[PDB]
Design brief:
RIKEN Structural Genomics/Proteomics Initiative, ribosome recycling factor, 84 residues, structural genomics, unknown function, Gyrase A, domain 2, alpha+beta, 6 strands, two-stranded antiparallel sheet, 15% helix, structural genomics, globular
């Protein structure tokens, strides 16, 4: 959870009957140089939810999930064919 780092801390996760930021149901903590960790020890039941948001965040990313620590690997520079 840092200023201008990864569009997740702002992302929202759909909960039971409510909405919240990814930096609410879990704690964002950058582990690797391109992997965002999200501890859901506070919401191990809303783990999937988070993962969803990510996927449902106009981001064709593949979020991981380990026990209660979600992993979000960062892609490489230049996304597919870009030139317009």
């Amino acid at each position: 959870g840092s200023s201008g780092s990864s569009g997740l801390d702002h992302i929202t996760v759909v909960t039971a009957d409510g909405k919240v930021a990814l930096n609410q149901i879990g704690q964002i903590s950058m582990k690797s140089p391109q992997v965002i960790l999200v501890n859901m020890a506070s919401f191990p039941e809303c783990t999937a939810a988070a993962i969803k948001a990510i996927r449902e965040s106009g981001m064709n990313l593949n979020p991981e999930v380990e026990g209660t620590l979600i992993r979000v690997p960062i892609p490489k520079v230049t996304s597919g064919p870009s030139s317009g």
